[PDB]
Design a protein around this nucleic acid. Structure first.
Ligand SMILES: [K+]
Ligand SMILES: [K+]
Ligand SMILES: [K+]
Ligand SMILES: [K+]
Ligand SMILES: [K+]
Ligand SMILES: [K+]
Ligand SMILES: [K+]
Ligand SMILES: [K+]
Ligand SMILES: [K+]
Ligand SMILES: [K+]
Lengths: 17, 17, 17, 17
DNA sequence: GGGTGGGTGGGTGGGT
DNA sequence: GGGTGGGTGGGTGGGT
DNA sequence: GGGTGGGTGGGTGGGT
DNA sequence: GGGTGGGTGGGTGGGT
């Protein structure tokens, strides 16, 4: 996943797809 | 709480302690 | 529930939906 | 963990120790 | 669970 | 959380 | 695995 | 990683 993501946004990157 | 208790009995068992 | 709510307003937020 | 455990009891076997 | 049970009982207890 | 809040709201929601 | 489980639990645990 | 996140998400993902 993209390095900039933090927190919830890391998990949501995979969820959103 | 003991199983045989019902209704207000269940709450009051906790109340009484 | 929204953070600003207090007291009865918290409960009624759920109640009113 | 012991094979018999299921569900919540698997996670909690690690939590207890 | 409901709002006529109350809100200084609390909000990860549930309403989802 | 308390027991003048009620017990067909429930007990896996929690309880000096 | 899912996104109402949460993000100070972590991203080398995975997102078949 | 924690157990107040849930257990029909899984246990070869990891576990002071
Ligand atoms: K995640
Ligand atoms: K996760
Ligand atoms: K009660
Ligand atoms: K009660
Ligand atoms: K309420
Ligand atoms: K209540
Ligand atoms: K677990
Ligand atoms: K887990
Ligand atoms: K209550
Ligand atoms: K997890």
């Amino acid at each position: 996943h993209p390095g900039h993501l933090k927190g919830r946004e890391i998990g949501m990157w995979y969820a959103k797809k």
